[PDB]
Amino acid sequence: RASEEQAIQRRLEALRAEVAFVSTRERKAQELYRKLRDELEELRLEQA
Amino acid sequence: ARVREELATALYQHDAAVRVIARLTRERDEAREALARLTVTGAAPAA
Amino acid sequence: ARVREELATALYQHDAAVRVIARLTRERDEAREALARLTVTGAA
Amino acid sequence: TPRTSNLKAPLMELSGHTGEIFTAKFDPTGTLIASGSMDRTIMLWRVYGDCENYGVLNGHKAAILDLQWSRDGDILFSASADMHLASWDLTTGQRIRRYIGHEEIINAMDVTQRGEELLISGSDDGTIGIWDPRTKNAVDYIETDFPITAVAVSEAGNEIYSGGIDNDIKVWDIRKKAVVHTMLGHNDTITTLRVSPDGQQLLSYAMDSTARTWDIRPFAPTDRHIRTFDGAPLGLEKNLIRGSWSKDGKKIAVGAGDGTVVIWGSDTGKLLYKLPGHKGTVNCAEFAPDGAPIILSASSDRTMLLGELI
Amino acid sequence: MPAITTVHESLPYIDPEPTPEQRAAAEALIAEERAKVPDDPYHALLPPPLPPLNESRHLTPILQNELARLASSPDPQAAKMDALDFSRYEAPEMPSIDSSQSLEETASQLWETLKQAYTAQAYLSARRAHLALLDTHGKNAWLIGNWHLEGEVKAVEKELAETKREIDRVSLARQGMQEAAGAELKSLEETWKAGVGRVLETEAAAEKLRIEVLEERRRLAEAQAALAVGN
Numbered sequence: 208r209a210s211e212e213q214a215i216q217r218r219l220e221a222l223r224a225e226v227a228f229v230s231t232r233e234r235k236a237q238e239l240y241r242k243l244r245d246e247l248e249e250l251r252l253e254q255a
Numbered sequence: 256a257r258v259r260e261e262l263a264t265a266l267y268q269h270d271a272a273v274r275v276i277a278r279l280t281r282e283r284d285e286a287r288e289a290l291a292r293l294t295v296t297g298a299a300p301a302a
Numbered sequence: 303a304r305v306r307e308e309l310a311t312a313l314y315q316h317d318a319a320v321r322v323i324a325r326l327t328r329e330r331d332e333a334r335e336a337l338a339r340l341t342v343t344g345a346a
Numbered sequence: 347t348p349r350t351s352n353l354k355a356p357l358m359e360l361s362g363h364t365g366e367i368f369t370a371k372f373d374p375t376g377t378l379i380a381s382g383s384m385d386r387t388i389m390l391w392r393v394y395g396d397c398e399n400y401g402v403l404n405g406h407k408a409a410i411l412d413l414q415w416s417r418d419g420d421i422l423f424s425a426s427a428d429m430h431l432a433s434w435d436l437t438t439g440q441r442i443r444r445y446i447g448h449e450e451i452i453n454a455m456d457v458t459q460r461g462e463e464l465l466i467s468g469s470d471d472g473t474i475g476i477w478d479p480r481t482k483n484a485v486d487y488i489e490t491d492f493p494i495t496a497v498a499v500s501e502a503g504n505e506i507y508s509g510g511i512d513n514d515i516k517v518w519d520i521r522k523k524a525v526v527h528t529m530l531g532h533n534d535t536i537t538t539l540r541v542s543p544d545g546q547q548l549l550s551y552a553m554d555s556t557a558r559t560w561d562i563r564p565f566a567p568t569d570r571h572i573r574t575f576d577g578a579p580l581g582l583e584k585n586l587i588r589g590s591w592s593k594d595g596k597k598i599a600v601g602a603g604d605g606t607v608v609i610w611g612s613d614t615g616k617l618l619y620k621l622p623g624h625k626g627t628v629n630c631a632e633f634a635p636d637g638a639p640i641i642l643s644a645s646s647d648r649t650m651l652l653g654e655l656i
Numbered sequence: 657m658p659a660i661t662t663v664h665e666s667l668p669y670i671d672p673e674p675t676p677e678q679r680a681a682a683e684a685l686i687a688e689e690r691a692k693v694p695d696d697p698y699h700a701l702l703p704p705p706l707p708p709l710n711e712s713r714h715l716t717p718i719l720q721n722e723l724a725r726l727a728s729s730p731d732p733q734a735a736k737m738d739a740l741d742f743s744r745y746e747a748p749e750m751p752s753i754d755s756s757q758s759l760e761e762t763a764s765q766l767w768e769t770l771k772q773a774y775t776a777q778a779y780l781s782a783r784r785a786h787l788a789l790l791d792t793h794g795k796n797a798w799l800i801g802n803w804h805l806e807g808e809v810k811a812v813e814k815e816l817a818e819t820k821r822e823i824d825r826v827s828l829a830r831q832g833m834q835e836a837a838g839a840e841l842k843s844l845e846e847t848w849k850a851g852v853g854r855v856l857e858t859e860a861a862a863e864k865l866r867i868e869v870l871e872e873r874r875r876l877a878e879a880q881a882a883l884a885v886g887n
Contacts, residue, residue, distance in 0.1 A: 208830035210318065214665045215837035222844040228291060229851040236858035240564050241502075243865035250872040258305040259703055265312040266701035271689035272319040273662055279326040280665075286333035290852065293337070295859040297867065298344045304657070305703055311658035312701075318666035320682040324674045325665070327681070346860045565858050613843075 347656050351638055352394055357623075358652040360391055362399055366646035368411050369588060369630045373419040374459070376636030379652075380422055381644055382410030388424060390436070393640070393652065403434055405441045411586070414457040421479070423465060425452040431467055433479050445477050447484040453586060454497035461503035468494030474508055476520060488523055490516075495586055496536045501545040501562070509536025515550055515560065529560050529570050537586045542595045547572065547612065549598055551589050555579045557600050559612060575610045577617050578602035581627045585646065588630040593637035597655075601628025607643045609655075623651045660701070669831045670838025745779060748772040 349356045365385030372379060372393075379391040388410060390401035408428035415422060421442065422434040429452065431445035450471035457479075458464045464485075465477040470493040476486045488506070496509030505526060506518040514530035534553030541548055541562065551557040555578060561570035580587070581603020589600035597618060599609045605624030610617055624645035634640035639655035674682065709720040729735035748769050753762045790797075 208826055208833075210315070210663050211667055211669075211830060212833060213663050214322075215667055215834065215841075217663075218665055218667075218841060219837060219844075222841050222848070225287065225291070226844050226848045226851070229848045229855065232291065233851045233855045233858070236855045236862065237563060237565070240858050240862045240865065243862050243869065244564060246869050247865055247872070250869055250876070253876070254872065256706060258309060259706065262305050262309045262312065263695075263697070263699070263702040265309060265316060266699050267695035268686060268690055269312055269316055269319065269660070269662060269701070270696075270699070271693050272316060272323065272686050274693055275685055275689040276319055276323050276326065276664065279323055279330065283326050283330045283333070286330050286337070290333055290336060293340060293856075295856060295863055297863055307658055308660075308701075308703060311660050315660050315662055315664060316686075318664040318668070319662070320679065320686065321666040321668060321671060321674055322664040323685060324678045324682045325671060327685070328678075340856075346857055565861050 349654060350656055351640060351654050353640065353652070353654070354395065354397075356654050358397060360397070360399075360650040360652060361648065362389060363387065363648040365409075365648060366626075367629060367644040367648060367650065368409070368586070368646070369413055370632060370642055370644035370650055371413055371415060371630075372632060372635050372642065373415050374417070374635050375419060376634045376638065376640070378415075378419060379642070379650075380413050380415070381650060382413050382424055382426075383648070384409040386410060386426075388413060388422065388434070397652075401436070401439050403439065403441070405434075406430070406432065411451075411453060412455045414455065416457070417459065417463075423455060423457055423479075425455040425467055427451045429469070431455065431465060431475075431477060433465075443482055445475075445482050445484070447475060447487065448473060450493075453493070453495040456497050456499045458499050458503050464499070464503075466497050466499055466506060468497040468508060470494070474506060474518070486520070486523070488518060488520075496539045496550070498539040498541050498548070501541065507539040507541070507548065509539050509550065509552075511535045513552075515539065515548070531558065531569075531571050532556075535584070538588045538590075538600075540590050542591055543593060544595055547591075547595065549589050549591060549600075551578075551587050551600050553580055553584060555602075557589060557598065557610075559598070573612075573615050575615055577610070577620070578606075578608035579604065583627050583646075585627050585629055587628070588632075590632045592633045593635060597633070599631045599633060599641060601631040601643060601645065603627040605645065605647070607631045607641070609641075619655065621653065623653070624649065667834045667838055667841075669834035670841070744772065745776065748776060 360379070360381070363381065363383040363385060365383050365387075367381050367383040370379065370381040377393060379393050380388055381391070382388045386404065386406045386408060388403035388406075389399055390403065391397055391399050403422070403424075406424065406426040406428055407430075408426055410424055410426045412425040413422055420436055422436060424432045424434060426432065429446075429448045429450065431448075431452065433442040433445070434440070435442050445465065445467075448467065448469040448471060450469055452467050452469040454466075454468040456466040463479050465475075465479060467473075467475040467477065469475065472490045472492060472494070474488040474490065474494060474497065475484045476488075478485050490508070490510065492510040492512045494508050494510050496507070496515075498507035499505075500507070500517075504520050506520060508516045508518060510516070513532050513534065513536070514528045515532070515536065516528045517526045518524065519526050529548075532550065532552040532554065533556075536550060536552045538551050539548060546561065546563045548560045548562055549557060550560060555576070557575045557578065559572045559575070561572060575598060578600050579602060583603065585603075587601050589598065591598065591612070596612055597609050598612045599607055599619075601607050605626060605628060606620055606622045607624075607628050608617065609619035609621070621641070621643070624643065624647050626646045628643050628645040630642075630644040632642045632644075634642075640652065641655055642650060642652050644650040709715050709723060715723075726732045726735050751765050751769050753765065757765075
């Protein structure tokens with residue numbers, strides 16, 4: 208039980224770190240998609 | 256004497272399992288880092 | 303009695319390590335399969 | 347697990363309004379409470395400690411139907427059915443100014459929490475007014491053909507979440523003054539649109555007693571509708587029910603017409619709570635923005651119930 | 657007491673039970689690891705060795721000789737020591753004195769038989785006295801012994817019940833903590849998988865949008881080059 212408590216704490220910390228990294232990657236990807244949409248809108252406005 | 260021999264065998268098995276678990280943890284961490292850092296390149300058509 | 307207590311603790315630790323190794327192997331196999339499928343697919 | 351928070355009681359009943367409460371909002375540090383009610387009054391309370399009514403704000407000539415706080419929590423923002431907006435000072439308890447330019451009853455408004463300060467008022471003449479909180483004149487206003495009962499500002503600060511009696515959420519852009527796209531799917535009149543704290547989900551309760559969560563993210567399929575939670579029937583009155591999100595974006599709390607505030611889990615759609623305690627309809631159900639389990643339910647029993655979620 | 661400080665990432669109250677095929681694969685992996693890493697007889701995890709018969713201070717030389725005799729027997733569990741002279745306590749029969757026997761030898765044989773008979777009579781009298789005392793106090797002795805044995809058995813059962821209750825309390829606490837941690841970890845893992853999928857889809861869409869923007873920029877550059885050539 209003591210070993211399981213320590214392992215649960217360590218695994219929770221690792222899962223939190225991995226989820227934070229994945230969330231940061233998702234936010235960066237969404238920002239890149241917004242920048243690409245803005246660039247596409249600017250190119251459509253410049254062509255028109 | 257039999258219990259001491261079994262305890263020594265279990266200690267050797269536990270050390271071997273600890274080494275194998277460390278190797279598997281390193282492999283799983285490398286695979287997870289590869290999956291997380293995977294970026295989709297430009298999928299150009301086969302011309 | 304000390305040897306029996308140590309042996310029981312070692313058996314419990316070995317069972318826990320076996321479960322941890324099985325979970326790690328399953329996770330590694332799943333990650334490898336996901337990477338292989340991502341390399342094979344290319345386009346979502 | 348009796349009580350895990352900083353309130354001096356697991357429940358507190360804030361009373362003192364002589365008329366129906368329509369909205370109640372928290373200071374963005376989770377410390378001050380403002381409730382506007384149909385007796386034309388904004389009552390200002392503390393939430394931590396003995397919880398005294400430290401302030402009353404008078405100066406609206408008709409029913410008050412919204413209020414938001416400033417960035418710091420020093421200037422209050424009241425919309426009222428006297429066709430007016432107003433910005434109020436809490437250092438002196440006086441009024442800074444009134445914003446004029448609507449012709450019919452104002453139902454919604456929104457302040458941009460970060461970005462640049464704009465007040466966004468939906469009004470029953472069919473207008474969405476964008477105001478700067480330093481000049482009484484309207485910076486701009488967008489014309490629709492239906493009354494607006496719901497309004498939210500985007501995370502990027504240029505998209506407007508209108509909801510009318512035409513049964514569909516409309517996302518407009520401020521610069522082109524035209525609708526970007528409409529998430530349709532509701533059957534009855536929209537009441538609240540509150541963006542998720544992280545910024546990828548939108549809560550929307552309408553008169554059909556169903557609360558739906560939609561997408562906000564730029565990459566989304568044709569149907570952005572995530573989920574249709576049910577379990578909060580609407581009562582006899584056609585009030586504008588105001589739901590909210592938790593701090594972690596996991597719990598959805600919406601008042602209902604039976605006096606019960608209903609909380610679902612936003613992840614899966616499981617009814618977490620169905621908290622009773624009110625006689626008439628519950629108008630404004632809000633979470634603590636700090637992340638504590640504090641919930642507030644202001645209802646047209648002339649009352650507010652400040653409770654815990656253990 | 658246990659001395660193992662190794663930590664394994666296992667939550668058996670929250671994690672799924674391994675399959676028999678999975679258990680066999682884990683056993684094969686552990687066997688391969690034990691084949692790769694040789695066993696260390698001087699490991700700190702192994703306990704101290706048992707001292708020998710000569711090394712033991714409590715073992716007497718008579719005890720060592722008896723232990724060696726028991727070990728030399730093919731069935732030490734069935735090995736039994738030599739019985740005492742039960743014929744000396746048996747009934748002494750009448751000795752048959754032949755006519756060729758000497759008077760001194762016959763007298764010595766009669767004296768030995770008389771001594772054996774006297775010892776047997778003394779043993780019989782002692783046994784009769786013991787039987788009389790047993791008939792006098794058997795109920796009291798049996799009741800006292802049964803009461804003491806029942807009290808000892810009740811004390812042992814109470815200690816075992818207390819140990820079982822403490823073990824059950826520890827198991828319940830571990831199960832609750834593992835349930836909470838497993839729920840949180842499952843939620844986090846589902847969120848991570850969904851975020852990975854969403855990030856991959858957004859990356860693919862961003863690549864498509866970048867391809868479209870590159871095509872538009874190439875068209876604009878071609879138009880600018882044509883305008884410069886025509887001017």
